[PDB]
Structure formats: C-alpha cells, structure tokens
C-alpha cells in the first residue's frame, strides 16, 4: 500500500481470527463477556479492520470469508464483523445448479456502495432496476407452475422474458477457469456492464435468444453469439 499500489487482502476466515482471540483472552485469564466472548473483541476487530482502508498513498481492499455461528447473525462474532463490512457476496448453491457461474445471488448480495448516490445515478437505477425485474420473476415463478403462463399479463410475461435473460447474462467465464473449461472468458468494465444490462431491460435485445447471453462478456459479445447460433 505505502508502495503505491492497490491491493487485495483475503482472510481465509475472519471468524476463526476472532474465535482465536477468545482462546488467548481465556488463557490470559480475562473474564468472559456476552455469550462467552472476550471483553476485548470490540477492539480486536476495530484494529484488524481499521487498518485495511484507502490511504491517499495507496489502498488495501479485503474480501473475507465469513462464518455465522448457528446461523445467528446476532452472535457477536458476526454482529461485530458486520458493522465493518461494506459489501457482501453470497454464493447460492441453487444459482449454481442452473449453470450461471459466478454463483453470486443478485439479491441477498448487498453493497452499501451502490445504495447511495456515489457510484452515480445511472448505475444505481440500472442496479435497482435489475433488482426488481429479477425479483418480479420469482413471484411469477410459482403463479406459473400452478397456473397458466399464458394468463400472465403482457408486461409481466415480458418481464419474465427479460428477467429470464438478465440472469443468463450476469453469468460469466473466468480466466482461471480456462484450465478447467477451455473457454477464454473475459473482463468487462463497469460501463459495458451498465450498457449491457440497462440495454437489455429497457426495451432492446428482445430479439436475441436467451441462450444468447450465457457465458460471455460485453453485450455485443452476446449479440455476435446470436449469429453464431
């Protein structure tokens, strides 16, 4: 960082870090705090985290695997670590089943750097826009299994037509995956991603097949995928 670069700090499991702090705090004979944690976990966290930030000479950015004990995000180990996190990337097993392979669940995955103005309005609305067309598609997904897909209104089955398509788009092939796969895969800017997604969901590319948007980069990469079919 002081070297001038931007860096990535992966932490195998931050939960194990805070838990280890408890064993030590116990050996030092310190008293037990809430739910048997150390009285010094409020501070132990604030130092590990507050050191990873963006200085005016460089920046450290950290992605840390989290563990929520007994699935209670109220437990201090999570509840503390959470007041520090600025984003959450959620890997869904069901999203993996289908085939979309950055298995990130577009909802359930939060980032307070998008919520605001701060990215910018265009990105924010496109983002919020997908968060709806993508969600509206779920509510209709069981009003369809049980009922006729045809009795779904015009704009709604066109929503289920567009959503069906954005979810195949926000899939992607990775470079590190070329050994596994064989497919090159690529890297798309924030701009081509907005253009591609905003372009899809607000009347356009409706003529392309849903297959079109599997596993490829910027939107035009997908448009050419349509001819290849």
């Amino acid at each position: 960082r002081d070297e001038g670069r931007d860096v990535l700090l992966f932490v195998d499991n931050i939960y194990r870090y805070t838990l280890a702090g408890t064993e030590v705090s116990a050996l030092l004979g310190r008293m037990p705090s809430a739910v048997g944690y150390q009285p010094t976990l409020a501070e132990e966290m604030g130092v590990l985290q507050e050191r990873i930030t963006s200085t005016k000479t460089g920046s450290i950015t950290s992605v840390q695997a989290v563990y929520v004990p007994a699935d209670d995000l109220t437990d201090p180990s999570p509840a503390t670590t959470f007041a520090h996190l600025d984003a959450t990337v959620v890997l869904s097993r069901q999203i993996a089943s289908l085939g979309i392979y950055p298995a990130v669940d577009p909802l359930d995955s939060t980032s307070r750097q998008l919520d605001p103005l701060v990215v910018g309005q265009e990105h924010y609305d496109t983002a919020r826009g997908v968060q709806s067309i993508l969600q509206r598609y779920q509510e209709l997904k069981d009003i369809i299994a049980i009922l006729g897909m045809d009795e779904l209104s015009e704009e709604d089955k066109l929503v289920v037509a567009r959503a069906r398509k954005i979810q195949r788009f926000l899939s992607q092939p990775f470079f590190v995956a070329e050994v596994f796969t064989g497919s090159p895969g690529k890297y798309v800017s924030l701009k081509d991603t907005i253009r591609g997604f905003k372009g899809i969901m607000e009347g356009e590319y409706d003529h392309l097949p849903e297959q079109a948007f599997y596993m490829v980069g910027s939107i035009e990469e997908a448009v050419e995928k349509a001819k290849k079919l």
């Binding site: 008293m31 037990p32 809430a34 739910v35 048997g36 007994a70 699935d71 209670d72 109220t74 437990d75 049980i146 009922l147 009795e151």
Partner: protein, 284 residues
C-alpha cells in the same frame, strides 16, 4: 423462553408446515380428476334441455310442471357445502352470500326452506339457525346422482304442492385454479333459454304415453342433473381452493419458523452467558 422448548416448539411448527405442504400436493393431484367428471356431467344435461325446450314448445302451456312463473310466497335452496374443511372461505363466502339473499326474501315476508348437501353446511346452519328440510352428506370425493335423488325429491314435491314458488341451487362455480365464485342460480321455474326454445323444426316425436307425461319426467331428470353438476363442480372448486389455501398455510408456518428462530437464538445466548457468568463470578 428456554432454548430447550423453543426448539421443540420450532420443530413442531416445522412439522405442521410439512403437513400442510403434503395436503397442498395431494389436493393438487385430486384436482385434475375433479374437473374431468365435472366435464362428463355436461352432455346428459344439455341434451335433455334441447329435448325439453323442443317438446315444451307445444305441451307446456296446458300444464307446466315447472315452466310458468307464479306469485312467490316461499322459496327453496339446495345448498352445496363441502364435506371437508381446510379450503379457505370457499364455504363461508357461499353461506354469506346465501344469508344475504335470504334476508332480502324474509324482509318481503317470504320464508326460505333449505336442502343441505355436505357436512360443513349442515354444521354451519345448525349453528346460525335455519329450516333444513332434508340433507345428504358424506359423499366426499365420490358424488353420485343416486344420493341427490332424496333431497331433490323433497324440494320438488314442495314445489308441486305449492309450498315452494322458487327453487335455487347454491354452489361455487369453478372459473380457474385461483378463482372460485359463490353462485346462486335459479333452477325450476325453468328459465328461459332463447337458444333452446326460439327455434323449431318440422318433425316431431311419437310419444308412447302422452308427451305431457314425458315432459314431466324429463323436467325432473333435468333438475337433478343440474343439482348434480352443481355439486360435482363445487367439488372441483374445493380441490383448488384447498391446494391454494394450503400453500398459504405452508408459508404462514414458514414465517413463524423464522420468527421463532430469532426468539430461540436470543435464549440460546442468554443461556450461555448466564451459565458462564455464574461459574466465574461464583468462583471468585
């Protein structure tokens, strides 16, 4: 509280949630066969109406069995409730409509007799009060024309003797899987179809006994078929409203399980802090 029993409490709601899901699934399978026998009930009735309307052209006036209108002083209601609960307001909405319509009649000073079909209706009107002249129940998933002959014969006879001036069927018409509509149709005094009555042809049957005798039999055969296909249809409405209202119960249980899981995790923590605290502070 007590994490010990909040668990069994949760596990309990989990179970009921799993049961209502099974019910939803079962009512789902039952659902298709229900519409089939609802469709198979149509030919007999519609063919018979054409024969009636035809032979009703000439013979009706001299003696209506049920063709002509007359001053209303009493009215009958064949009510089709379901033998089984757990299907939302399918019954309540029907009864509530019936009650409201009976009120407009009683305000005019006319009485209302009820022929009851199905357990749930017998129970309801046993509580809210009513003049049930006859009933049939326990048909369940196997309705038959046989079992309807009783109650219909009673209501018909009342019309013949002048003790009834109108006769309605009350049942839910099945629009689609997520829409059943409480309906009160008037059967007998025959209504009024232009389709089956306006047109006529040159030929004519040769009735063995008088055509007047057949016009009577057919009229009674018809009214029974009406009541049957009202029942058989209401039954197909039940399977839907059930599997739908059961999905709701499965989702209600799921929400309680989320709320409970919180109440639990709270007690789970409280329990572990106190046990730890009393041990260490106790040692001192």
């Amino acid at each position: 509280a007590g994490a010990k029993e909040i668990r069994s409490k949760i596990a309990s709601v989990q179970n009921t949630q799993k049961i209502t899901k099974a019910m939803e699934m079962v009512a789902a399978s039952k659902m298709r066969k229900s519409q089939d026998r609802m469709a198979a009930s149509r030919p007999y009735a519609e063919t018979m109406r054409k024969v009636i309307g035809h032979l009703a052209h000439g013979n009706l006036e001299y003696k209506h069995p049920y063709l002509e209108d007359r001053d209303v002083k009493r009215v009958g209601y064949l009510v089709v409730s379901t033998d089984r609960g757990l299907c939302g307001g399918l019954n309540i909405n029907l009864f509530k409509k019936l009650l409201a319509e009976m009120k407009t009649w009683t305000d005019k000073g006319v009485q209302c007799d009820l022929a009851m079909i199905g357990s749930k209706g017998v129970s309801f009107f046993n509580s809210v009060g009513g003049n049930v002249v006859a009933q049939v129940t326990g048909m369940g998933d196997n309705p038959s024309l046989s079992e309807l002959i009783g109650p219909v014969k009673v209501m018909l006879q009342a019309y013949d003797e002048g003790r009834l001036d109108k006769l309605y069927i009350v049942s839910n018409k099945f629009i689609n899987t997520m829409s059943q509509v409480p309906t009160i149709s008037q059967l007998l005094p025959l209504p009024a179809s232009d389709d089956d009555d306006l047109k006529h042809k040159s030929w004519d049957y040769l009735y063995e006994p008088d055509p007047k005798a057949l016009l009577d039999t057919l009229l009674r055969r018809y009214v029974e078929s009406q009541v049957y296909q009202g029942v058989v249809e209401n039954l197909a409405s039940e399977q839907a409203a059930r599997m739908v209202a059961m999905k709701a119960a499965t989702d209600n249980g799921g929400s309680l399980i989320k709320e409970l899981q919180l109440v639990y995790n709270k007690a789970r923590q409280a329990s572990i802090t106190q046990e730890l605290t009393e041990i260490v502070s106790g040692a001192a």
